[PDB]
Design an enzyme around this catalytic site. Structure first.
Site: not given
Ligand SMILES: *[C@H](S)C(=O)c1ccc(Br)cc1
Ligand SMILES: *[C@H](S)C(=O)c1ccc(Br)cc1
Lengths: 302, 302
Positions: B41, B143, B145
């Site tokens: 992502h 933040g 991930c």
């Protein structure tokens, strides 16, 4: 989102853990610069448990009576001294992994992370709080004494606890890193026991704010209370008194949620008087008191 | 004595955490040998959330579009590739702190430690379990991930989770380290939600054994049950079925306490049918299901 009993990352403390052996007694030590800190009980023997005179026991030892092992490396002990209930072993090598650090003594109601260790090897990390009766509800097995408790701020490790013993109710007692016990305990065999304990009110309120920040709102109500009326109820339920300093410290969380501290107090009063009627808060069915206002702010969304 | 939700010491994983930036997106990566693993992502942009074609997005990037920072050192990206939902960034430097490690995929009902990280900097460590519905009840903010979950056996870190996203109930979803999601989730914006969940029976029984090892015995009774009758009750209360393999895995704890598994099952049946009548077990007022039999044995006295 989510709320967990979160510890500090333990790597800075892992690099300080060593094994200290004296006679047939092995336990953990903390190696910082060229000093190893450990419980002085390491110089006792099986017969010395009742009334050890540590000054006498120590004057009969020399440096070579202390075996210090850092992983697979033997550290040569070059001096030894006692400070209150801890021993200070000067070694010939400064730990290259020494973090920036401080020795702080914490207050009842404050939290810290524990690195449980056996034979100088870290085994697990968990969060604890210093109870109002100066015990901690730890998880420790034989061989864990010498394990330390700490907080980390920026790069700096503030050591606040060294583990010594287990009391008859299964709770734990230890010292700060200057060797002074938390609470009325001693490092010898007596009938000593934990005194009466109370619940840490400001922490419960902090945790209710965590829950609101995280979407549990069912325990809220339209009522408020005065601090005096709240504290009458608190006393009745074995909760510590709430001070205006506590109200002030809860200011940020109050502002973030828009729930006045005395409104949240009204909620707590109702929860004490009524229970939760089969509901839960942040996955608990009882009121949690081992999160400080700081712990909540650090973990929760702003 | 004592029983805590204990994580593994995090130092071996702390030394692997890095920051990965692509465009205006920053998140965490895991640096092992000369590869950095992160969520794919990171190559999305604000408009790409609905239906990203990651193959297209990636073919339009080059190595210099990826900024990798390990503490205060920029790592030069020399290759990039995608594997399922993770990105693999080949860097010109092998991490000198790489531990012995494995990439394992875990089963629902198994536990692991999470090192929550922001901007490549570790912030906290806690224990989690993979729910039967393949979510985890984590504690994660924006933040986070790229943060990983792991177990440690002897010196070997078995990485089992990388964090990707938060579902609408506040629970969390992620992948194994080969980039394959746990459960029916995808790394894009949809109406996806956690499916129905159940309680992990074998873990609850393990935890009741922990309690007995630790002196909570009030929930014991003189009754036994058959596995079939137990499982009839389990089904009624949304508990997973208990298998004979589960009984076998509980063998050591049964032997240590001298309480047959089916006797402890009779206790659990009574607790499901009656509640705890205002009592607690290991400081909880509900039945805890995030300790495996292995977790209990590791933490508890033998
Ligand atoms: C070992 S955990 C240790 O340090 C110790 C200190 C005090 C007493 Br009493 C027993 C054991
Ligand atoms: C950031 S935590 C991240 O990796 C991510 C993955 C998937 C989705 Br959908 C959103 C964010």
């Amino acid at each position: 989102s989510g709320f967990r009993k979160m510890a500090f990352p333990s790597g800075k403390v892992e690099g300080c853990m060593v094994q200290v052996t004296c006679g047939t007694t092995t336990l953990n030590g903390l190696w910082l610069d060229d000093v190893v800190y450990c419980p002085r009980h390491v110089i006792c023997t099986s017969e010395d448990m009742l009334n050890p005179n540590y000054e006498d026991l120590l004057i009969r030892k020399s440096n070579h009576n202390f075996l210090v092992q850092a992983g697979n490396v033997q550290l040569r002990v070059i001096g030894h001294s006692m400070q209150n209930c801890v021993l200070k072993l000067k070694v010939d090598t400064a730990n290259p992994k020494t973090p920036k650090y401080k020795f702080v003594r914490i207050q009842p109601g404050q939290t810290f992370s524990v690195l449980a260790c056996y034979n100088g090897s870290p085994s697990g990390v968990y969060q604890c709080a210093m109870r109002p009766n100066f015990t901690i509800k730890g998880s420790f097995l034989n061989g864990s004494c010498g394990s330390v408790g700490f907080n980390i701020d920026y790069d700096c490790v503030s050591f606040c606890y060294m583990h010594h013993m287990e009391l008859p109710t299964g709770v734990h007692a230890g010292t700060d890193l200057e060797g002074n016990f938390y609470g009325p305990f001693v490092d010898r065999q007596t009938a000593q026991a934990a005194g009466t304990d109370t619940t840490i009110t400001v922490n419960v309120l902090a945790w209710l704010y965590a829950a609101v920040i995280n979407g549990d709102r069912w325990f809220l109500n339209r009522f408020t209370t005065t601090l005096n009326d709240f504290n009458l109820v608190a006393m009745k339920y074995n909760y510590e008194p709430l001070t205006q300093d506590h109200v002030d410290i809860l200011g940020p969380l109050s502002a973030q949620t828009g729930i006045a501290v005395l409104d949240m107090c009204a909620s707590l009063k109702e929860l004490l008087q009524n229970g939760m009627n089969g509901r839960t808060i942040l996955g608990s069915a009882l009121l949690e008191d081992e999160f400080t206002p700081f712990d909540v702010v650090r973990q929760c969304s702003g």
